[PDB]
Design a protein around this ligand. Structure first.
Ligand SMILES: O=c1[nH]cc(CO)c(=O)[nH]1
Ligand SMILES: O=c1[nH]cc(CO)c(=O)[nH]1
Lengths: 245, 244
DNA sequence: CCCGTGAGTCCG
DNA sequence: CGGACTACGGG
């Protein structure tokens, strides 16, 4: 009963259905680090999904300087290389916007959401085995979208049409991964993810609770004030602190 | 070298460029450093035999000069007759029909190249004299058309296509200027002028960068007495002396 | 070409 | 409510 190989296959399944869609209009570039950063992604899943999980943290999509460069979700380079200890070759999506070049583990920029994310669990837990013992992390959509200028588009900033097909498809995948991991509880990082997961799972009556935490993005002011403080508090109300040690 | 190193720098450059891909408005792309390599390497072999003090730098080829001869500002009469370079020229994989490459048979004369080489002919007489201490090169070797075959400069390109290219063309420029020993770069036009200062100041190269007006007949100021303005600018920058 | 007047983005 | 940076059209 290791989910790794089935998680990875839910993901290659999902890469398939997505390779099929065509985007438009405000969208000019699309990148899926799940193709070009497969190696480190695999290595994450292999090393850290060796067994079934009670909790799943769930973010919305990769950001430009985290998962888009490392393949690990909330994948800020330094914490991924020094704490998770995941290395891997990464190549380059087929068309790059010059302001959003993939440099892999030689990325200079630090993604603030991801560094916050993992810096909390690194304080909470010490050692990655402790945090992954019962938990795991994953994103609802692995694709990353940019307009003509390099400006990032979330899935919600997408026009109606491609947006509903694309979420419909990730919603089904999300249900498989949840079943494969074996989880009792899911914490969306951010409102979009908590809602979306909720609506996904109840639509196939999967019997799992969906809570949330504050997103650590710096576009959100309450987060720049003491994200870790708030969240350590949100995880205590959810009853998960005993889980991570 | 620097003939041989200069060429290695250009062949590393083509290879980065053979990767990229364009679109949108860009429908054709030619590289005369591939189909016109021979007359380009004769040019270099003949006139880049020692280190240099000055580097004239244009922006990119035009449709009837370097696109046809593989020499920078390479208008066919001045190239064959004063510089004395000839060479087989083959053809781009996909030609726009109204811009077929015909090499040293091109009936069109590029006005820019004609002005530019004529000036130096009159100034220096014999090319060996021009190239005792100078050389000429373009920042970018590709040429671009749109569906109708009209020319797009690197400046006419959408931003995303343009930044990738130009940042692959800068490195090259640095490598080139470190290979020739150049102490002065003169951009032929504002665009190369500004582009090369940005670029050499960044690697912190020991080198000045100045500018002369561009000959293109698209520039209204260049249509009356370009030759006479550029002789003035060149006098200020003080290189009339090295030009004998 | 060469320049001027100006919109899109970022400010973690 | 700003400041700095860095597509297109007329000459
Ligand atoms: O800036 C320019 N203009 C025109 C030519 C002609 O081929 C050139 O080589 N460089
Ligand atoms: O003589 C020329 N030279 C250069 C051009 C530029 O495309 C032209 O149209 N006519």
């Amino acid at each position: 009963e290791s989910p790794a190989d089935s998680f990875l296959k839910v993901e290659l399944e999902l890469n398939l259905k997505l390779s099929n869609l065509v985007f438009q209009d405000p969208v000019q570039y699309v990148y899926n680090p799940l193709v070009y950063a497969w190696a480190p992604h695999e290595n994450y899943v292999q090393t850290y999904c060796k067994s079934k999980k009670e909790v799943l943290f769930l973010g919305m999509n990769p950001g430009p300087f985290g998962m888009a460069q490392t393949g690990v979700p909330f994948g800020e380079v330094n914490h991924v290389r020094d704490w998770l200890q995941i290395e891997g070759p990464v190549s380059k999506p087929e068309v790059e916007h010059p302001k959003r070049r993939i440099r892999g583990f030689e990325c200079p920029q630090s993604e603030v959401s991801g560094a916050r994310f993992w810096s909390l669990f690194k304080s909470l837990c010490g050692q990655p085995e402790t945090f992954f013992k019962h938990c795991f992390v994953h994103n609802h959509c692995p694709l990353i979208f940019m307009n003509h200028s390099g400006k990032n588009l979330t899935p919600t900033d997408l026009p109606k049409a491609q947006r509903d097909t694309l979420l419909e498809i990730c919603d089904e995948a999300l249900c498989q991964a949840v079943r494969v991991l074996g989880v009792k509880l899911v914490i969306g990082v951010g409102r979009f993810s908590e809602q979306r997961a909720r609506k996904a799972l109840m639509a196939e009556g999967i019997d799992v609770t969906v809570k949330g935490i504050m997103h650590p993005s710096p576009r959100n002011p309450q987060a720049n004030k003491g994200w870790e403080g708030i969240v350590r508090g949100q995880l205590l109300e959810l009853g998960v602190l005993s889980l991570l040690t």
